[PDB]
Motif scaffolding. Structure first.
Motif, PDB file in Angstrom:
ATOM      1  N   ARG A   6       0.826  -1.192   0.000  1.00 54.11           N
ATOM      2  CA  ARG A   6       0.000   0.000   0.000  1.00 54.11           C
ATOM      3  C   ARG A   6       0.866   1.250   0.000  1.00 54.11           C
ATOM      4  O   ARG A   6       0.582   2.211  -0.728  1.00 54.11           O
ATOM      5  CB  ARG A   6      -0.891  -0.006   1.246  1.00 54.11           C
ATOM      6  N   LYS A   9       2.549   1.739  -3.414  1.00 51.55           N
ATOM      7  CA  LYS A   9       1.557   2.253  -4.370  1.00 51.55           C
ATOM      8  C   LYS A   9       1.244   3.735  -4.131  1.00 51.55           C
ATOM      9  O   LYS A   9       1.122   4.510  -5.095  1.00 51.55           O
ATOM     10  CB  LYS A   9       0.276   1.381  -4.288  1.00 51.55           C
ATOM     11  N   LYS A  13       2.018   6.823  -6.737  1.00 47.94           N
ATOM     12  CA  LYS A  13       1.010   7.816  -7.136  1.00 47.94           C
ATOM     13  C   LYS A  13       1.520   9.246  -6.902  1.00 47.94           C
ATOM     14  O   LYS A  13       1.341  10.113  -7.751  1.00 47.94           O
ATOM     15  CB  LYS A  13      -0.299   7.576  -6.367  1.00 47.94           C
ATOM     16  N   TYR A  19       2.641   1.500 -10.896  1.00 46.13           N
ATOM     17  CA  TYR A  19       2.894   0.459  -9.906  1.00 46.13           C
ATOM     18  C   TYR A  19       2.472  -0.902 -10.470  1.00 46.13           C
ATOM     19  O   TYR A  19       1.378  -1.042 -11.056  1.00 46.13           O
ATOM     20  CB  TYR A  19       2.138   0.736  -8.596  1.00 46.13           C
ATOM     21  N   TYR A  21       2.482  -5.193  -8.991  1.00 46.59           N
ATOM     22  CA  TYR A  21       2.885  -5.993  -7.852  1.00 46.59           C
ATOM     23  C   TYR A  21       4.119  -6.815  -8.150  1.00 46.59           C
ATOM     24  O   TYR A  21       4.941  -7.052  -7.247  1.00 46.59           O
ATOM     25  CB  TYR A  21       1.787  -6.930  -7.387  1.00 46.59           C
ATOM     26  N   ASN A  45       6.653  -5.321  -5.862  1.00 44.15           N
ATOM     27  CA  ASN A  45       6.325  -3.934  -5.495  1.00 44.15           C
ATOM     28  C   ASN A  45       7.065  -2.951  -6.402  1.00 44.15           C
ATOM     29  O   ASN A  45       7.857  -2.097  -5.971  1.00 44.15           O
ATOM     30  CB  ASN A  45       6.657  -3.654  -4.024  1.00 44.15           C
TER      31      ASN A  45
END
Length: 178
Positions: A6, A9, A13, A19, A21, A45
């Motif tokens: 999280r 990501k 942004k 992004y 995974y 990531n």
């Protein structure tokens, strides 16, 4: 550690970067630094972006490192590796110790060329760069920084600045011969 996906990501942004995974082929393009002591892993990531027009990739190699790779405008066949003194020397047989600078050691495939790159700005950088930038090195078309995977978003931002600064200092490395 916790919320790593999280948080990565969110940071992507903020930067306007993409992004993913996981990317199954990303790691194959780099061979040195932390890439030589790992195998059969994929990049996780993953953040894909640009810094002033040049590609930058940020990714985790599970339980090894978070890496930031920045594309170089002009390629070189010289490798410089700047790493904390308590870490193992690069294992490759074409790269040698040039000398210590502060908390770090400099290794290179061309000691004469690396000497030219190791001027006052390099000395200051080796002392000022954060200890989280554990291993920094270049390959032909990329300059990279490896940090602990437990690094946080402030450390990812400082890593972008560190890789940019190290790349600038290596602009003096000679071009690939024709």
């Amino acid at each position: 550690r916790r919320g790593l996906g999280r948080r990565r990501k969110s940071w992507a942004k903020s930067h306007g970067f993409d992004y993913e995974y996981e990317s199954e082929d990303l790691l194959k393009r780099w061979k040195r630094g932390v890439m030589s002591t790992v195998g059969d892993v994929t990049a996780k990531n993953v953040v894909l972006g640009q810094i002033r027009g040049e590609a930058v990739f940020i990714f985790d190699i599970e339980e090894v490192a978070t890496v930031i790779a920045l594309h170089r405008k002009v390629g070189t066949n010289v490798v410089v590796d700047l790493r904390l003194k308590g870490l193992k020397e690069p294992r490759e047989n074409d790269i040698w110790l040039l000398g210590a600078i502060g908390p770090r050691m400099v290794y290179s495939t061309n000691l004469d060329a690396a000497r030219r790159a190791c001027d006052r700005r390099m000395v200051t950088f080796a002392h000022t760069a954060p200890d989280c930038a554990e291993i920094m090195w270049n390959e032909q078309n990329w300059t990279l920084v490896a940090m602990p995977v437990t690094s946080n978003r402030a450390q990812w931002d400082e890593g972008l600045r560190t890789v940019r600064q190290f790349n600038d200092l290596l602009r003096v490395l000679p071009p690939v011969p024709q």
